[PDB]
Amino acid sequence: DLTLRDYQMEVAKPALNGENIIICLPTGSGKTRVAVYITKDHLDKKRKASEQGKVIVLVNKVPLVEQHLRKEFNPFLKHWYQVIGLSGDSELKISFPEVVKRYDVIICTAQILENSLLNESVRLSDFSLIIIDQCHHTQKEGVYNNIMRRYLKEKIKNRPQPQILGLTASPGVGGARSNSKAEEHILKICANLDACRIMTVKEHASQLKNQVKEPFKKTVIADDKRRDPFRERIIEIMQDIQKYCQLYPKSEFGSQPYEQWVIREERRAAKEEKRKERVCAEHLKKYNDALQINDTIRMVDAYNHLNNFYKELKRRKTAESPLVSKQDETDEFLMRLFHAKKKQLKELARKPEYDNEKLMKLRNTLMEEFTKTEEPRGIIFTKTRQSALALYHWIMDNPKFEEVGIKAHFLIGAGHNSETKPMTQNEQREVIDKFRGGSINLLIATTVAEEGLDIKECNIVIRYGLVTNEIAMVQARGRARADESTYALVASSGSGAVEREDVNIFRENMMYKAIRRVQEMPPEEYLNKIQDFQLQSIVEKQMKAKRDQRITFLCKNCHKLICSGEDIQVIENMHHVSVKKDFQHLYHKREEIICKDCGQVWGNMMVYRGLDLPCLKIRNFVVAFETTKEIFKKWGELPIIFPDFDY
Amino acid sequence: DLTLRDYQMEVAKPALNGENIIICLPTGSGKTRVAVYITKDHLDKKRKASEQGKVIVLVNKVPLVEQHLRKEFNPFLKHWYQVIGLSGDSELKISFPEVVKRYDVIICTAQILENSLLNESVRLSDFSLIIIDQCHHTQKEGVYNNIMRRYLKEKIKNRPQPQILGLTASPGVGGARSNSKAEEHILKICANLDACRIMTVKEHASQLKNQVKEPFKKTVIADDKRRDPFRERIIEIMQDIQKYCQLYPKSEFGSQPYEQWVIREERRAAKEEKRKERVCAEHLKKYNDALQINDTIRMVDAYNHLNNFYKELKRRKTAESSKQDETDEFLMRLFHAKKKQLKELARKPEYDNEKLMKLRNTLMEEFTKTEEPRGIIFTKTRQSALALYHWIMDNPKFEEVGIKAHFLIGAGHNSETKPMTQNEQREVIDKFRGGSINLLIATTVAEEGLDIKECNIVIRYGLVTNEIAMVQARGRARADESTYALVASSGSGAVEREDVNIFRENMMYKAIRRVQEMPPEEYLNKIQDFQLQSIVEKQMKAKRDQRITFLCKNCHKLICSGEDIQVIENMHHVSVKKDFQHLYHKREEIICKDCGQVWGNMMVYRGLDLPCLKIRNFVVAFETKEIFKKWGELPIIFPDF
RNA sequence: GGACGUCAUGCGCAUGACGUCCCC
RNA sequence: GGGACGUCAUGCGCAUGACGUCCC
Ligand SMILES: Nc1ncnc2c1ncn2[C@@H]1O[C@H](COP(=O)(O)OP(=O)(O)O)[C@@H](O)[C@H]1O
Ligand SMILES: Nc1ncnc2c1ncn2[C@@H]1O[C@H](COP(=O)(O)OP(=O)(O)O)[C@@H](O)[C@H]1O
Ligand SMILES: [Mg+2]
Ligand SMILES: [Mg+2]
Ligand SMILES: [Zn+2]
Ligand SMILES: [Zn+2]
The missing domain is CATH 2.170.150.30 (RIG-I-like receptor, C-terminal regulatory domain)
Structure with a gap:
């Protein structure tokens, strides 16, 4: 029984009448349900005008295909039309050109469609409605834009094209700092989806308000005025190494510019046959890693990061099943150096008073917010994978968290391009579905949890010194929309992260005003600007087409x-x-x-x-x-x- | 008779007691007078302890040597000590090593001292007090920092050095956007001048307040919702050229990214023997120039910019005592066809830029408050200074109400506009204080250093730079009923860039308040660390520089x-x-x-x-x-x- | 005229972290 | 395991403009 709420209609109306549009509906409003209502309405009118009805719904994430089927598309369309879900993970013995012809509603990851368009063939005439999910990604060299590049290419040369639905919550500002450049980005992704309008809930705004519960905002700052014994003890060690190799930094200890320098130095040294320098540069990176670990995680992890690194060298240097010898002077120097100052670091790391302040701020923000309701749920957005796995073990080794209710688990990424080893696509389901069951109470996640995936509503969402862009900001707020919701940012004054989130709050506010202006924009003007951006969007591909075309x-x-x-x-x-x-x-x-x-x-x-x-x-x-x-x-x-x- | 006001003392005190410090005193407070009072006090105590008193005052601008002499140093020290002013402009037949030994108070441009330090020789032991004027420049590879690099080099190796006075109003934040990185920059220029403290008027703040009159702030924005006939007529012409050569942009018309693209394109084309492309790219730059001229100046100047460019080509192509290519004859005809339209369209005053009417309005009201008012317009480019001058000339209502204006540009020979002489700048600025010239239309030149008369109005005409220059420009307007106006358009991004500078300035005051409140064991350890890496920053450049x-x-x-x-x-x-x-x-x-x-x-x-x-x-x-x-x-x- | 430095703006490249998709 | 894309941070280079200095 396929209804829409009054706001959902207002936003959908022009798509029901055939206009290509982008839809801006907050997280928890039900943008996918509007897609369903539009696919059916679109397809029904093609039946009743005796014509082709083929609709392809593109996504950016494999779990969203199977999730959109189960929870939205199949219940309302399987019994009237031919619905299918595709991905690279799907094990089908049927080519995509066939799947086009045999099916009416095709849900799939956009690259499946692009792979076919590359090249009996597939092309964009074969579909009559293309719905792009999370259309703010329709940008740059993103798959979504390469699809639309073809669509736009045909449009200009034609002097029989499908309808296009853009789905998102917030289109973004594209990193801009000016209200002029907010417009320009909005117009640019309007132009990439050939939209006749960007569409927001104005007339039924009061009703929308009640559907999505906006959380209570906080910024719990940590003025790191504590003594930092572990820091000092390490910088000593690093200066001892820096003298030994005679490689001196132009940068602070425990920071990015240092890390960049010390990596450039390891390379140069290795190219020039300077073992002594590179080995020290290699070790100096690990020490620098341990400093920034000490800034964010507990300091036992910083210690462990080094201990494990020097443990690895014992295996690789000690022989097994006769030589000049593996163990160099420089190697024996650094190894001894660590073995001397080791016990000090270990016995210093087990002093809880000198652990990072942010962790006590995190602890405090958890303990109060997990005692408001009898069944509360929440998320911690840490930056690195290691900091997720660590904060998990931090919560485990701490009986007061468990006693008050908190049973936690980490939720990381899938890729094989990290020094931390990933989770499987399947392992992410195992956690996220445990999370909605109540088996797992608290997700400690990287960015992975911010966009797309259907995660249970949250009473608290903590950004643990993590700031990215305005989009992800507002997405993270969307994950906490239960009763008495709270969106907290736990950064330190030394980060710069409080001021970076404050720029995103300014950026978000620009975005709403850039939408309000492109909507109010007279159509002769809007037309002429969109056509211009599209004309240069094709030329942006031609300049990459010369870039890519290059013992x-x-x-x-x-x-x-x-x-x-x-x-x-x-x-x-x-x-x-x-x-x-x-x-x-x-x-x-x-x-x-x-x-x-x-x-x-x-x-x-x-x-x-x-x-x-x-x-x-x-x-x-x-x-x-x-x-x-x-x-x-x-x-x-x-x-x-x-x-x-x-x- | 060498007094100090109560605030001037508070700031000077530790320098009188021998401590190396930086001094933060607003524009109009009289930081130079504190230098004078410190040089004398320093030198008197060396006489009375039977010892060496040699003091060198470094500046960054030639007019500041002769200005600091006349108006501060000579009247209070010539009759007690041996005072001299030096520069590259000075015509002396005496080597600098001699001038060291023959004189007690040496005012000069810092490069004079560095030239000598490069290499009987000169070195930093020879002076007992080094006063650096506008010490916020003591940064990066600036001359001031290369001097101090040597000083700091000696300090660390010593296990007999001069005292160091830093003079400025606002040290800055160095482009940072975080209160963490504000501290870090403040500490960095504290560390470059080896200062024991950054020094601000706290105890006598109320008195300072009364001395310097803080102006009334405005942001007069221009929502460019007018029709732009001249723009449209040009973009047509540019698209006609872009088809001809088949070079298509990835950028807006009348903007920087376009200008960068079209310059990269002219080069590539020229390297690959593609005359047709480069000639069009060359012409396309001039058209792009005319668009952004239309955004800022009047549109007659945009027209003139093109007309003069195509006039030049007539001389160079027409023989005397074939040159004309197809591509050349195409573009020339193209302009000659659409010319009359542009000219007759440019003389319609209603379609001139909105910012000019906003400027006009802000002038006309502010030049009718007082019977003798004075003011400054900070334009971005040299051309926009020379143009806004001619804009005010060709406009009888400005003249009638009181405004007699003149441009004030730079000195360099690396601009497509031709400069003013060092001397020509005096001719204007001294006319300005006389009342002969009422209104300076200046580039950045007017913002720092030079003694310009106080102003009732100061207009930033769509010009934003950094926080330092921001506050400097406000300092130039401190007469009675002063006003600091920013006239930008919504399309610029400049209103939001000035707003970041207002945030940055506020960080700067809070970063000063924290380095001052900082416990000395901490402050010491941080300054020593920045100094240690400041020397290593030179070693990495010492490897960079050392490279038909x-x-x-x-x-x-x-x-x-x-x-x-x-x-x-x-x-x-x-x-x-x-x-x-x-x-x-x-x-x-x-x-x-x-x-x-x-x-x-x-x-x-x-x-x-x-x-x-x-x-x-x-x-x-x-x-x-x-x-x-x-x-x-x-x-x-x-x-x- | 040459060299050097500073500031603002824009563009490009690199490193790291995070995420995703496709293919084996 | 390889390829591609995106996001954030950091660093580097080039371009335009403005300003300054020094040596001619
Ligand atoms: N018109 C409707 N009537 C009843 N329930 C609805 C309606 N639209 C959506 N829902 C419910 O809300 C859910 C959508 O939530 P969610 O996926 O968080 O929204 P979004 O797509 O904005 O992220 C649906 O799965 C469904 O249970
Ligand atoms: N203690 C004082 N007594 C009398 N006049 C003073 C005193 N201090 C400064 N002045 C006056 O102020 C003028 C200098 O101000 P100015 O150069 O505008 O400030 P700044 O040095 O901050 O740029 C001098 O010409 C001088 O006449
Ligand atoms: Mg949904
Ligand atoms: Mg002065
Ligand atoms: Zn080997
Ligand atoms: Zn020639």
Whole structure:
């Protein structure tokens, strides 16, 4: 039984009458339900005018396909039309061109559609309604914009195109600081979705107000005026290393500019055969990491970060199943250095009084807010993955949290480009569905929790010194819309984060005023501006179309002669491997492939057709041409390509 | 008779007792008078302890040497000590090492002292008090910081140094947006001047308040909702050119990103022998210039900017004693077709910019409050100063109500507008205090340092820079019933940029209040750390600093080899081949014979008429091609003629 | 005329963190 | 495991304009 609330109608009306539009409805309003109502209405009128009704709903996240089916599309359309959900995760034995022709309502991740459009074929004439979910991403080189680039390309050259629905809560300002540049970004994503209007709940605003409960805002600041024993004890150690190698920073200890400098320094050193310098630079990064860990997490984690790093070196340096020797002077210096000051750090880390202030501010904000209701739920937005896994263990090892009600769990990302190891797509469901059950009470999450996914309503949402953009700001507030909701920001004065959130509050307020002006804009003006942005949106692709249209291997640490370019061959289209048979002797094995001479990590052992072969990563070698030298980050940056192992 | 007011004392006290400090006193308080009182007090105590008293007062501007002498230092110290003023403008036949030894009070531009320190020699032991004027410049690779880098270098290695006075009004925040990074910048320039404290008028704040009259603030915004006929008529013309060459922008018309794009495009085109493209890109810049001129100045100036540009091409293309390409004849005709329309449209006063009517309105009311009022208009570009002058001239109602105006621009030779002489700036500024000139239309030049008369109105005409210059500009208006106005348009972003500076200024006062309240063990340890890394910042620059054919950019002809070019003096590069006489033409200026592109200018050197060549106008071809901006960017150096 | 520095604005590139999608 | 995209922070470079200095 497919109703709409009065505000939902007001926003939908022009889409029901065929106009391409963007829809701005807050989190908890039910923007997807408006999509459903529009697909049906659109499709019914094509039946009743004896015509084609094919509707494709694009998303940016695999769980949103199956979530949009179960909870919105199937219940209201499966029994009248042919509905399907697609993704890369889907195991179908049917090509996408077929799925177009066999189905009426196609929900899928936008890249599935773009993959087909790349190239019997698929094209945008085949659909009559394209609904883009979270359309603020229709921007730059995003998939959504590449789709729309084609649509717009056809429009201008035509002198039979589908209808386009944009779905979002807040379109954004695109990092701008001026009300002029707010307009310009709004108009730009209006222009990318060829919208005849951006659409907001004006006439039924009072009704919307009651549906979504706006939370109570706080900014709990931490003036770090405590003594910082752990900091001081580390900066000592770092200065002892900086003298040893004679590499002096232009930057504060425990900060980004230091981290950038010390990484540039490790590279340069490695390129110039200066082991002593790079090894110290490598170690100096880990110490710098431990400082900023001490700023945010508990200091036992900072300690552990170092302890584990020096534990790893014991395995890689100590031999097993005769040499000049792996253990260098520089290595033995740094190892001893840490082993000397270790006990001090450990016994200092277990003093709870010198743990970070932010943690006591977090503790305080939790304890009061988890004692207002008998069944409360909440989220902590930490910045790094490690800080999620740590704050979990912080809550575990702390009986007062558990006693008052808090049973917590971390919720991180999926990627394989982090030093912390991810969660599976499936493992995220396991938590999030436990969260709505009440099994898990408190999500400690990275950005992952901010957009899209259906997470239970929250009584508290804590941004633990995390600020990103205006969009994510307002998304995070949307996650807390239960009774007596609270949106807290727990930063320190030294961060700059209180002032960055305050700029986002200014930006958000610009965004509402840029929407109010593009709406009030006379149509001759609006038309002429949108056409101009679209004309230059196509030219932005032409400049990238010119951009895109454009030896020996040595151990970074000890500079040994190991491999030629001819010795390396690709497996599949990614795993590069060596084929020489002297090569057996020049590496060692641990639990992982390390240099025999120096114990530097080279890669890992794999199996391929019952053969134990060595994988080599480009991280860990200096490439020598002929003379110029280089460290490349990923294999694709090299100039010559290697042949496949087996032809 | 050398007094101090009660606030001036409070601020000076620790300097009188020998402590290195920075002094923060508003514009109109008399910070220089505190320098005078400190030099005398310092020098008197060295006489009376039978010892060396040598004091060097560094400045950043040549007029401030002669101004500090006349109006502060000589009247109170010439009759008791040996006072002198130095600069690069000074015509002395005496080396600086001598001037050190012969004089007690040495006022000079800081580079004079650094030149000597570079290298009987000069060094910082020779002075006992160094007073740095406008010490907020003691930053980065500024001269003031290179001086202090040496001072700090000696300090750390010593295990007999002078006292150091920092003079400023507002030290700044250094572009920061966080109260954490405000502290960090304050501490950094505290650390560069080795100050024991930043010093502000707290105990006698009420008295200071009365001395300096704080102006009434306004932000007169212009919602440009008018029709813009001139704009539309130009964008038409630019689209006609963009189709012709097939170079399409990724940017708005009449803006910076367009200007950057269209300059990158002219270069690329010139490197790749694509005359058609570059010539259009060159012309497209001039059209883009005329749009942003239309945004700020009157539109007759935008028209004139184009007319004069196409007039120049008539001289360079028409022969005397084929040059005209298809692309050239296309663009020329194109302008000649749409010309009369632009001219007759430009003389319609109703379609001139709104900001000008907002300016007009803000002037007319504020120049009718007092019978003798004075004021300043801070425009952005030099052209917009010279234009707003002519705007006020050609407008009898300004003159009738009292306004007699004049422009006040810069000195440099790196602008498309031609400068004022050091002397010409005095001629205006001293006329301004006389009442001969009523209204200065100035670039940034008027904001810092120079003694300009007090103002009833100061207008920032869509100009915003940093917090420092903001507060400096407010300082220029401290007469009775003073007003500080900002006249920007909603499309600028400038109202919001000034609002960030207002936030930044407020951070600055709070960062000062915290470094002052900071316990000394903490303050010491932070200053020593910034100084330690300030020296390392020089070491990273000390590694940075320690690191073929010539073809006409337009027509790509073979003109000169590297061997054909020889330097005159250490700057004017010139060709010596004698086929070379034929390949250029002469106008009123050296142009290509084939295409009429400007190559340089004719000079005389030992009675020889020789051709100067600028690197702007040639594609350098190795064996790769390149356009270099200035000769020093090339890899091989040429011998002297 | 040359060199150097500072400020504002805009553009581009790099590093790190976070997230996503597609493919094997 | 590879490729692409986006977001945040930081750093670097180039362009335009304005200003200053020093040496010619
Ligand atoms: N017209 C309606 N009548 C009744 N319930 C509705 C209606 N629209 C939406 N809902 C309910 O609200 C839910 C939408 O919540 P949510 O997904 O948070 O909104 P959004 O799509 O804005 O994020 C639906 O799943 C449904 O349970
Ligand atoms: N203690 C004082 N007694 C008398 N006049 C003073 C005193 N201090 C300053 N002045 C006057 O103030 C003028 C200097 O002010 P100004 O240069 O505008 O301030 P600043 O040095 O802050 O730029 C001098 O010309 C002088 O006549
Ligand atoms: Mg929903
Ligand atoms: Mg003064
Ligand atoms: Zn090795
Ligand atoms: Zn030529």
